[PDB]
């Protein structure tokens, strides 16, 4: 990131946003995954 | 500069404001202008307040 002393790109640009703790405990399931559970009943425990 | 920053605050109670500058020495009369308030989506009176 050093650019010879010019304020580098990762410091001349502003920080943004925050990190969601909820996003880390949220998943997405594909339709292809629904057949992969045992018993044809898809819930959080059967996916795990 | 001599000109000081001011806010123009919406009369609609939305808390929406514009900012501009003013020569307070020549023009101490408070600035009042009809401006578009984007919260209520209407032109309403805006009145000078401190920045």
């Amino acid at each position: 990131g050093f650019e010879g002393g010019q304020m580098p790109l990762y410091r001349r640009l502003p920080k943004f946003g925050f990190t969601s703790r909820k996003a880390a405990i949220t998943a997405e399931i594909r339709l292809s995954d629904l057949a992969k559970v045992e018993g044809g009943v898809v819930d959080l425990n059967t996916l795990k | 500069g001599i000109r000081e920053k001011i806010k123009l605050v919406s009369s609609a109670g939305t808390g929406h404001f514009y900012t501009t500058t003013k020569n307070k020495r020549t023009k101490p009369e408070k600035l009042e202008l009809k401006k578009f308030d984007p919260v209520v989506r209407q032109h309403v009176i805006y009145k000078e307040a401190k920045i």
Binding site: G1, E3, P8, L9, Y10, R11, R12, L13, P14, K15, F16, G17 | K5, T19, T20, T21, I51
Partner: protein, 64 residues
């Protein structure tokens, strides 16, 4: 050992679907009264890192 992320870069850039990076524009922190609404409006959306700078960003973010 594991490469260390440049943590300041991780706060400024996010990787997009085709592997570019989005960032927030400079010049919208303060000294805003003198700036035209048009100028500020165009600075509000996120922008893509330019071709010349991608090398510098990628070096900083090995785990992006």
């Amino acid at each position: 050992p594991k490469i260390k992320t440049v943590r300041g870069a991780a706060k400024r850039f996010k990787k997009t679907g085709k592997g570019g990076f989005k960032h927030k524009h400079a010049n919208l922190r303060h000294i805003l009264t003198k700036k035209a609404t048009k100028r500020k409006r165009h600075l509000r959306p996120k922008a893509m890192v330019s071709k010349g700078d991608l090398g510098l960003v990628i070096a900083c973010l090995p785990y992006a």
